[model samples]
Target: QDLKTGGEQGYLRIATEEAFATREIIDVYLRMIRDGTADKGMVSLWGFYAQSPSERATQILERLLDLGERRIADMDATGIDKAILALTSPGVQPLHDLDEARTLATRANDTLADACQKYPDRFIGMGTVAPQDPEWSAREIHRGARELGFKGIQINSHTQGRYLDEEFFDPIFRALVEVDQPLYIHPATSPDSMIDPMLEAGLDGAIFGFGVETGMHLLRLITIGIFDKYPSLQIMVGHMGEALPYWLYRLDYMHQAGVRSQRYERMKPLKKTIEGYLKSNVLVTNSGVAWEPAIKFCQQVMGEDRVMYAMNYPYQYVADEVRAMDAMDMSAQTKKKFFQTNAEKWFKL
Candidate 1:
């Protein structure tokens, strides 16, 4: 009945938010490192070292593109049967040039699909697209899913600080709904407009800023009536709902009360409460956060069917996350729902 024993136990483990990047993608960071354009916290998140920046960049790039023995070996060691691969953060979100973003996103999805094809058993791919051009991004999502066999689209938190609540991004949402695919809204580098205070204190990147940025973005989707328009669209947020589940009661209370109080009366009214949208439309992954209390709390609030497992590999240690999952004090059936069943159903794994 042990979950960490891999195939021998028949308790399939599928990690939904595992990340990988192509060489073209890593080259962007390498260029930033060379030009000193990369933020210190951003470079650190990519595992770059100040001692030997070039060497560290090369090493990290190699690890990112390796979907073969090295990756499988780590999976075997950690008892993770499969990892759904996605492009690392700020993927196409940071690119300002529409043409460049389009070309890179196409190549990224094609490259990811090739890896999934090459390692069909050990890997599944979630494609990356350039949301800068919503129509183009939607077409790429359709192509990636239908032709390339990617399971979903992984978009970063926002495009140049603009969240998806804006009407321009509706094509992107419609595409996912049409394709019956999920959108994995991964965290991007925090926008300078709101994160300077956190950056001054050195807490602005992945550790805190990611959750803050992404959690707010998810909230925008719900409060702006995204689900009202496209009721079936599925959005996956990592790190235990990006800390949103913990604050839902207050979020629901404040927002509904504000509506009654005529606060922000110019804003369109949502068809349902914030909690309603979260429960019905959102799915969360236990990526980068593996603590029992957070996991149990998310499961209790989001329901077991809405929660899934993820390693957040290359950011969080694989073996550590696996052991954490193994140590959770939950029923075997609930464990199966977290580790395997929900992902299988959510991502069509």
Candidate 2:
């Protein structure tokens, strides 16, 4: 059966209504202004202008909010069987004043909550939390889930460029476990302080830094005993587990080599191998890499139940992505779970 554009088999895009560095993809700003959440007559949230032959405007414009019609139209055209929406990144969470950050997050989550109430099945939300300040971040996660219906929380791997497992943030993990909700730790860009030559080169930092940084965050969480302390808390990492799956053996081997040679006996072994933690708390999606091999590896390591299909749509095309994975060998039950059940269960979709 050929899948048509607007039915069960048609592509279901989980999109953000925010305009992008690409073409001003959707009209998200207009409604934002009318709601008094944005200033009217503001420049478009995103656009790229070619200046001279190859030069482009590197300065990116940002929107205060992406709400209302911006979300609706994008979800509709994207064949979004349903969208799991979130506030755009470096969200209110990054604000310097903890109280102000909490207020902004509360307001944002409430707005999303209202939208969800009106269109329950069509939308699900992931609340953002202030990582630098753990107390409020914890409180907001509970409020967003208990009072509002946000399915998960989104955090960057770093906090003000500090690693996530830094001592200051452990309370945040306790709070997430309390609510029994998942945290989507989307890759924030690599930290600026790192001395890596690859990061200095830019492309490696841009293309690969996210995975490395996110992978490190997970490893830190494990080594510091965060997982052991809170086994039920789950975290999602995009771009296929952020290089973790591939490097498991080396990470374990190197850590062991040093200790076996008695180079550092103090260091405890990684509580769980990369695959063990990945199979348990981590989920990798087919975000932009809709390639079959990548999807297979994720499933191979984490099992099909852990690999979710994501279009990275609007930023890319749905046709190629959905088609790419359709041919992979997977049982009907497993495919259904990947496409629907896992997300539904994990994020309360």
List, residue by residue over 279-299, the lDDT tens digit for candidate 2. 777777666676777777767
Go through the candidates in order and give each one's C-alpha lDDT: 0.81, 0.60
Residue 331 of model 1: what lDDT? 91
TM-score of each: 0.92, 0.78
lDDT of 1 by residue, 152-227 (tens): 9898888876889898888999999999999999987677678778877867777798888899898888878888
The best candidate in terms of TM-score: 1
Each candidate: RMSD:
2.7, 6.9
Q: What would the TM-score be for candidate 1 when compared with the true structure?
A: 0.92
